[PDB]
Amino acid sequence: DLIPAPPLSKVPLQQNFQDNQFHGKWYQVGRAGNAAPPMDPELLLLTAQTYELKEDKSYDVTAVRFRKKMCEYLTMTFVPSPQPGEFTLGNIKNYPGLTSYFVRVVSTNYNQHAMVFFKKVQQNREYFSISLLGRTKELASELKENFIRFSKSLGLPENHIVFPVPIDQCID
């Protein structure tokens, strides 16, 4: 049932990560991961996220999506770990069935695009995912192709990579 998570050696880490340049609003322009494609195609609408850099240097990351006529929000806290650009999950004891959570920012120019890699253990199944983030709702096709390449290098097939359609509700 799941494509194996890749060894973390296959996942680059953005060098000299600057938390205060990575903050603020991003659109999840590309998604890839071993989780199954959604059965509800309404989840294929573009979401937005805010990486709110807090006083204690953790981020309170809030994602919004449009679903069933409403804006649905979810906030999680990313606690910086010893390597700049890597994070674990704040107060994981508050998340039922979620036992492990890891974030690595793979690459970014801060002002246009980012790729962020996630690996978590939920119900003792190991999931991984990669997000392509844009400061605008659309990105250059060469960036989308690079994201596909990268996703396939971690063992993902084309049907586990998707490019959500920009919407105006909730996210702008």
Ligand X SMILES: O=C(O)CN(CC(=O)O)[C@H](Cc1ccc(NC(=S)NC(CO)(CO)CO)cc1)CN(CC(=O)O)[C@H]1CCCC[C@@H]1N(CC(=O)O)CC(=O)O
Contact 153, 147 (CB under 8 A): no
Q: Can you point out the beta strands (E) in the chain? A: 24-33, 48-53, 59-67, 70-80, 86-89, 98-108, 113-122, 125-134, 161-162
| Per-residue binding letters, 34-73, with ligand X (x by CB under 6 A) | -------------x-x-----------x-x-x------xx
Nearer to ligand X, 95 or 152 (CB): 95
Nearer to ligand X, 11 or 61 (CB): 61
Could you give the CA distance from residue 108 to residue 5 in angstroms, rounded to a whole number?
A: 22
Ranges within 76-115 binding ligand X (CB under 6 A) = 76
Q: What are phi and psi of 131, to 5 degrees?
A: -110, 140
Query: How many residues contact ligand X, by CB under 6 A?
Result: 15
Could you give the CA distance from residue 120 to residue 99 in angstroms, rounded to a whole number?
A: 8
Q: Binder to ligand X among 106, 114, 115, 116 (CB under 6 A)?
A: 116
Note the residue count of the chain. Answer: 172
Nearer to ligand X, 84 or 92 (CB): 92
List interacting residues with ligand X (CB under 6 A): 28, 31, 47, 49, 61, 63, 65, 72-74, 76, 116, 118, 129, 131
